[PDB]
């Protein structure tokens, strides 16, 4: 009997109040803020290079893109500001690399363009760090990659940066090797002109097409005819753009591959309450508090919640719902964490890993302003509960950051270290070990005591001075743009569009099974 | 039968000749040089920061970890060089941590233990990625780890290199659940004050040993966290009971030792090593024959050429470094087609018979050629990186000469995850030569100059020259990459075979699994 | 490095002491009860039965026992005291039936063996609980079954506790087809006349043995087949050693006494192709550093005193070597590493009341030794609640559960000695009977049962009081007395270790001073199968 009626989560927001006003103001100045500068980033890599690549009769990246996905499906596009102010006098518009998730030939694949008006298609350290993360994600969720190489190799000043460590260039080659061993298929399209970091990517592909006249491949002399015909290195012969990427469609379908799911499925159902309003309702102030509740009940099916352990640990918020059918459980963060919440988070880890039921975290840190220590000692031994637990879970893991992330709290809440699936914030986050305000008295505590024990006076306007430079540098780096042009934290979203993005990445993260969930260790 | 008769390699070099005696001066002032640095490194954070340290009561990490491993086993440090000249104006000897691998009652352990004399202990990001090696290196040849925590948690400055990123500290406490869910032991031993990235260290370890009044976990004391909040497990009154603690909860540990790799009775090399400082030197330019230095390190000089007369450029053999099976590949000259394919070939055979594998890496700069139709060597280039990525056997990569471009890819460099990886004094690594590159700059600059309608100035050209070749060579220095924590460690080469010997008895303790292959452009 | 020197548990008890001294006359007088009891019960069934045995040339079981077993091995016999006193007026020494572990050709095996004198070997229901119990543990220690088959059958009276149900006569025949598909070789060797029941034990056995003309295998007896149908015929023609290896092929090896069949079934046992393998790792074993006689003094008679069970531990570990972890968390239970006789053993003794500590701090090692495969050995010493009467027993029950999951959910091998009292959700904590420990004993002074004598007596008094309050009946001062004097006494009989040994629980009472070699050879007895990985639930918390 699935007719059983059930109790709704959220509440009408009050509109009239002030409060509400000047929350929407804000977010909507954020929200209007990035939609500018990811227009400015889309644009290109300027108008002289996109200019000459039009008249050399290539195709612009994004057009590239549009015509590859299949016709009105949506583009989950990842880290469009990666290389943001990154470097000093550089512009590096999208990290001179284009990455995201579409369906083509009705199969969701994770594609990989370089974008060659960006330095002609040379390899920033930060294009590298992309490549490689998009690369990871399709390994873990077993997409098909395709890539649109049109690259000039490495860049070859900041070369110590890009060619020599694990995570630099080579790991590229070795994750393609590796994806192709286990079956995760992968094709190259020699859209341009590469070079000897270009030339090894389709010779490791599994299928290759080269254009006609654009497409050369040299190991450092390269064209189409000859790679076709003569080193056999091509594996199709394409005309121009609009053949290689007709071409490629072909080659997807002819892949033989059908998405089974392991997790039950329901009729998917729209929440109960507009998405806009979590605008007025978060604001962008992170001294307020906000129930975590209202941005659950705002992007659910239904607006319906199942909450576990209500009256224990309040400040963590957890319970079973479905996103387009799709079971999850939801941990938020309501307040400070205590030993109850996290006893309470890894009961819950435990039960979902269990069930076999993916994972949806939500981090609101909260800053010590309120509580100066509250005998943490006892956090410690219970915070690690859950950060064990996290870790080992095997279930797809989905980490939003809608406010600030400090301290450990971001490693007990899933954090970046800990291999989520997806990781996003919203433009009003903030995250650094510890707030400005908190850690500038840490560093005058610590240089007056030294110098104490030395017998060095420490001035009391000395800790005032080391006060506001500190404070200062806390906020600039906790800046959301500062953590995504580095590529941490995957991309920025736009709070309305929520529900949508964790519908795609959840949809894409079904595609690889679910294996079964071993734990370490529980201290009791 | 096992009396079977076999050739050995290798050859007496000529001592009087004037090039031996040039080069063994180059490389015996090279290693003169390395080890007057590692004796500077090993003297500590300063002498006051040590006599507050002896003050407390407290032991110095050296000697914690003397103490620790069993009586006269051998300790193989990892990263000395970490840190080294790193940060403009801060000096962190070490990298303000110490990691190897030693014997703890009989059974072989990684340890990481953090010197407090620099910056109380502090975590710079070097000391985070030092650190995470160290747990990926016991993770992979499943050792059991020893923490020796006491720091100060993470450097306030320079946060953002250390708390936010995925190889950043949580990546620690990530490696340490996982290995623990995997059945690898993980031992804390709280020496000194923590923090708050100290204290999870304890709480997440299987086995927990604190001082009485030394240790605080946090307010956070021996006997409040062993009596009320019981995160301790064990109460130790000082330095050495707590050694003699963790010493017997490694030997509760049960676990034995065995070997899948089949063994032979250990025999010397036919030759001294010290003869490989007259035989390399340390000039780049001139070439050597590899067939000497594998018949220096290898058990009896014994080796069985595979395809020797077929890409000889690359040379690959079959031999045994203290009764352990090896395949030996190493370079000879510039890498073609055939050598591509020889190695492929080899590798695969290495990867069917579970053999463990040994790369010895000297690409060379292409003074000699300046393309050679390299487009061919793309074709087979890729061929032996995918099947030394694929291989599952343990690899070992150890560079002896310059490891530049795609070579670095192709002999197992350190983007292919081998088991270990060193380098000798006078190695150079980096994308291209200084000269290659600078070359290549200025026609790049020119022939777009010329499509704008700018002319390029000849003397242009000869001044962005002159500054790359020094970047080049300044970065490619060997302490350019040990300071990162790229390449482990540099070792004297007289040590390569002790150094071999005791990486492969370390990494012959997980077993060794079946190898999968990719698709084969072939 | 193993040369490290190691402080070694235990201290030298203070004889002069006049507790010591009446502690070791109560505990002697216990063991030489036991002893004469035991004596006792291997007299055997009777003068008259046991002549009548020899008259017909057949072995009195325990020479058939002695006979098979290498020579000089010991012999872990398992519940001598099954069926003591538990029929009103009907004697079954033993229960029956023999059970116990031997060596066989150099193989540790199970040996089930009949006792003819008793009752013609009809089975009583505790006979088919011993023998279920021994099938039980040589299916999960993958030990080789022997059966020296010499029964009536079912006794006819009582049929109802020992035909229908699942735990019933059927389960025999259920435990031999199932450990025959595993593996677990099955020899029966027929030294008597069988009946309908006893015929088809050697029918499923892998291999039979079966003596010239005291072997009979008839699938219903002489008076049985007139019964159901009215045919008459010897008892040779119907069911023969001749017959059966000739023209049936019942048997397969055909014997000319009971030397002979023993000898067969020795060579049988050889041609097993087995090698025992251990996964443990293995150190020389050295003694205690303490004679195990003091225990005695120790531990004493009465189970108000409490002892240190440091010293039973110091007292039966291979040098006195323990290594206690988390000794001053939740002292009440004592846990730590030790080795006997060269296998790894993690030790969990009670030293007190269970508190949440304690139940965290259990959690915990058997958590640890799940991890890394390391044999379980549970010490049993509950306590009364004399001391305290609730002491907020609700915080105890969030975290007991915890333990008594984490104990079920093993996979290791566990073996329980109750040296003291065992009481309420403590046995179930402790590794009781109900969570399948591989081997259960009990000291001679052991008291069982759900709550102490006492204790039970006042809260029946005060439930009958409140509920004739409600009711409007006044419930009598002296009737709360009335009713607490009889409870008091069935709590004490009903406790006795000899109460819980006539029933199969707990398998047999052991000697004190022989606790180190019994739990050396059971342990030995154990590793013969494989040691599983282990999967929890979920752990609260
Ligand atoms: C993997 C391993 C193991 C090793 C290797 O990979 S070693 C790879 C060596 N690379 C090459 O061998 C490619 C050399 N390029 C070329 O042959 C072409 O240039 C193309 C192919 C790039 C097409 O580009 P193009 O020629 O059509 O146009 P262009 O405007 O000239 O393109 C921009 C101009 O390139 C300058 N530029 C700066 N840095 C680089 C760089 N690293 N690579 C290329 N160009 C760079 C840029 O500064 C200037 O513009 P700017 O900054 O002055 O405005
Ligand atoms: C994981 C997550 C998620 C979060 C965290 O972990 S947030 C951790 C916050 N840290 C603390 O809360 C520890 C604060 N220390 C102390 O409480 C003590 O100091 C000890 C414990 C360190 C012992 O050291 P000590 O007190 O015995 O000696 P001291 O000489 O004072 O030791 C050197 C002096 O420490 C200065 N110093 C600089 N940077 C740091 C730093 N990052 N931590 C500590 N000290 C630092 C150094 O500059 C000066 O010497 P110098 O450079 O002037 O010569
Ligand atoms: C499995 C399923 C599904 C079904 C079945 O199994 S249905 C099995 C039906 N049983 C028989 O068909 C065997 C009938 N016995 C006989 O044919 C023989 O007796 C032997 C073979 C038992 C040898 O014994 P024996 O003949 O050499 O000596 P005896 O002294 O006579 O032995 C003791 C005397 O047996 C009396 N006695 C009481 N109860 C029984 C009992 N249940 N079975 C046998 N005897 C019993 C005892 O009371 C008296 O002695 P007591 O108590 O008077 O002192």
């Not at 920025?492 to 079964?516: C, H, M, Q, W, Y």
Request: net charge neutral.
């Amino acid at each position: 009997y699935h007719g059983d009626s059930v109790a709704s989560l959220g509440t009408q927001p009050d509109l009239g109040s002030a409060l509400y006003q000047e929350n929407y103001k804000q977010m909507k100045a954020l929200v209007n803020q990035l939609h500018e500068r990811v227009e400015h980033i889309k644009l290109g890599g300027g108008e002289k290079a996109r200019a000459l690549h039009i008249s050399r009769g290539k195709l612009l990246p994004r057009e590239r893109i549009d015509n590859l996905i299949d016709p009105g499906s949506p583009f989950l596009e990842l880290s469009q500001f990666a290389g943001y102010q990154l470097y000093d006098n550089e512009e590096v518009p999208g990290g001179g690399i284009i990455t995201g998730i579409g369906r083509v030939s009705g199969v969701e694949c994770m594609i990989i363009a370089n974008d060659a008006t960006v330095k002609g298609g040379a390899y920033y350290p930060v294009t590298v760090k992309k490549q490689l993360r998009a690369q990871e994600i399709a390994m873990q969720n077993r997409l098909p990659c395709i890539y649109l190489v049109d690259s000039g190799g490495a860049y070859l000043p900041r070369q110590a940066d890009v060619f020599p460590d694990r995570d630099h260039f080579g790991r590229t080659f070795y994750n393609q090797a590796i994806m192709s061993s286990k079956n995760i298929a992968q094709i190259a399209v020699v859209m341009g002109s590469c070079t000897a970091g270009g030339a090894y990517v389709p010779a490791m592909a599994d299928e290759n097409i080269i254009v006609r006249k654009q497409g050369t491949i040299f190991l450092a002399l390269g064209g189409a005819d000859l790679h076709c015909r003569k080193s056999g290195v091509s594996d199709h012969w394409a005309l121009d753009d609009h053949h290689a990427l007709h071409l490629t469609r072909k080659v997807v379908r002819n892949l033989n591959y059908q998405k089974k799911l392991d997790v039950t499925i329901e009729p998917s159902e729209e929440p109960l309450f507009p998405a806009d309003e979590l605008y007025g309702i978060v604001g962008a102030n992170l001294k307020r508090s906000f129930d975590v509740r209202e941005v659950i009940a705002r992007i659910v099916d239904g607006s319906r919640f199942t909450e576990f352990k209500a009256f224990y640990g309040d400040t963590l918020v957890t319970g079973f719902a479905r996103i387009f059918g799709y079971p999850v459980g939801i941990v938020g963060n309501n307040g400070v964490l205590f030993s109850e919440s996290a006893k309470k988070g890894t009961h819950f880890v435990q039960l979902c890993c269990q069930r076999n039921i993916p994972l949806l975290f939500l981090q609101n840190i909260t800053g010590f302003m309120v509580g100066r220590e509250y005998e943490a000692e006892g956090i410690a031994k219970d915070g690690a509960k859950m950060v064990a637990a996290v870790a080992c879970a095997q279930v797809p893991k989905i980490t939003l950051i809608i406010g600030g992330s400090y301290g450990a709290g971001n490693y007990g809440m899933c954090g970046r270290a800990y291999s989520p699936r997806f990781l996003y914030i919203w433009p009003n986050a903030r995250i650094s070990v510890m707030g400005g305000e908190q850690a500038a008295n840490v560093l005058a505590t610590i240089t007056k005591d030294q110098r104490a024990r030395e017998g060095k006076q420490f001035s009391s306007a000395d800790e005032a001075a080391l006060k506001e430079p500190i404070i200062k540098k806390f906020e600039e780096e906790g800046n959301p743009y500062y953590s995504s042009a580095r590529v941490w934290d995957d991309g920025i979203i736009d709070p309305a569009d929520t529900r949508l993005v964790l519908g795609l990445s959840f949809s894409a993260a079904l595609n690889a099974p679910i294996e079964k969930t071993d734990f370490g260790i529980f201290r009791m």
